[PDB]
Design a protein around this ligand. Structure first.
Ligand SMILES: Cc1cc2nc3c(=O)[nH]c(=O)nc-3n(C[C@H](O)[C@H](O)[C@H](O)COP(=O)(O)OP(=O)(O)OC[C@H]3O[C@@H](n4cnc5c(N)ncnc54)[C@H](O)[C@@H]3O)c2cc1C
Ligand SMILES: Cc1cc2nc3c(=O)[nH]c(=O)nc-3n(C[C@H](O)[C@H](O)[C@H](O)COP(=O)(O)OP(=O)(O)OC[C@H]3O[C@@H](n4cnc5c(N)ncnc54)[C@H](O)[C@@H]3O)c2cc1C
Lengths: 188, 196
């Protein structure tokens, strides 16, 4: 299938960068793969609208066309990012804000939303330093992207993989998680 | 007291803009108020770090100094923003990402975090299109900023005011919402002081 990896981290030698490598090298050669590196793209995540350029025409904003096309093209999206303040780094938040717009990713129904991205699945891989025993007691941490962004847009299924206590654990332990990620990737 | 209003909306003629005007116009004159229009400032919400500019040195990033100083100065922070995808607009998320950094807003304890913004309180005003009965059930919708950002940084108390079904309701109901903001605003006072 057609695979889009949306990767979010400022540092090319980060652990996230390593996670990206595991995914890229382990995806079968039968898939066609594009990597979207938001930091490398110098992506501008600030959504602009007003009376001059109306919110209604956001799906037609030129600067965002490339990204709309990458999303439409894809069958499966893989998101890689660290948890910053319980959620997506700002550049990735604004990727959603700006690219997942009405009349593209969804449209408004009599009540609620009608998702337009049917036929697509996703995988979320996220790192954070919070212990797993604590996770039922915390808000978001990837649950927003999965349950309240991707799902309402008709993207299903959405697998969520959290790698927890990521800075407390050891290099050994981290490398076991990378191996887990590599194997999940092969099993797609 | 010293009040920092952090305002987030791209449209000067938005309903959020009118919320801002209500807050600004109704704060007691005893307060010193400063408004931070993140959009007007062309704030860059993208946190940068790498081997060159280490994460360790975020609290000394030059471009953010003006904003660190605003937070330090403030006794009370008022956040005004619309809910986009269950939370903060990317520009405001990045304000937290870049400004509320370790060795400024917080540091690491033997075990947890210690907030350093003690002695500060906050008020969050959010607007969205979701029914208010859904609020206890949805993730975030301002709860992350209140419970999982502000609070851990030792800011307290924090009041969360949700303006719900904000687009479905009538223009009259919305004006009644503005009344509510205006009146809560008037009761922002140092203890045993009245509104000037
Ligand atoms: C602004 C900000 C906000 C934060 N908010 C939250 C909060 O809401 N919740 C909380 O739980 N966390 C929070 N964090 C922490 C954050 O989620 C982590 O720092 C992140 O998940 C780690 O990923 P990284 O790629 O940045 O790690 P990195 O700093 O790059 O590396 C992490 C560790 O992995 C190691 N490593 C790198 N490569 C390898 C490898 N090949 N083999 C073995 N180990 C390796 C490193 O050397 C290091 O010890 C926040 C951090 C920031 C900067
Ligand atoms: C990218 C994006 C993501 C979104 N994600 C979600 C989702 O996660 N959750 C969901 O609930 N909503 C969400 N929304 C919608 C959003 O939260 C609302 O549009 C917003 O809260 C409204 O505030 P505003 O400043 O933008 O309103 P405006 O659109 O500017 O105004 C809204 C209404 O109030 C009116 N109004 C303006 N001034 C006055 C006044 N002086 N007196 C009386 N009426 C006035 C207007 O004329 C209009 O009818 C999303 C929107 C966007 C753009």
């Amino acid at each position: 299938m057609k695979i889009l990896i949306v990767y979010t981290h400022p540092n090319p030698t980060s652990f996230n960068a390593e996670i990206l490598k595991q995914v890229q090298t382990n995806l079968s050669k039968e898939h066609t793969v594009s990597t979207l590196d938001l930091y490398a793209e110098h992506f501008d995540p600030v959504l602009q609208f007003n009376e001059t350029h109306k919110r209604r025409d956001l799906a037609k904003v030129a600067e965002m066309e490339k990204y709309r096309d990458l999303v439409t093209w894809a069958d499966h999206l893989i998101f890689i990012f660290p948890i910053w303040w319980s959620g997506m780094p700002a550049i990735l938040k604004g990727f959603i804000d700006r690219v997942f717009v009405a009349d593209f990713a969804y449209s408004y129904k009599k009540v609620g939303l009608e998702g337009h991205l049917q036929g697509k699945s996703a995988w979320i891989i996220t790192t954070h330093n919070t212990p797993s025993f604590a996770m039922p007691f915390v808000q978001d941490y990837g649950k927003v992207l999965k349950k309240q962004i991707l799902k309402p847009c008709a993207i299903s299924p959405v697998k969520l993989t959290e790698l927890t206590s990521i800075e407390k654990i050891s290099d050994d332990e981290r490398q076991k998680l990378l191996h887990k990620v590599a194997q999940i990737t092969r099993n797609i």
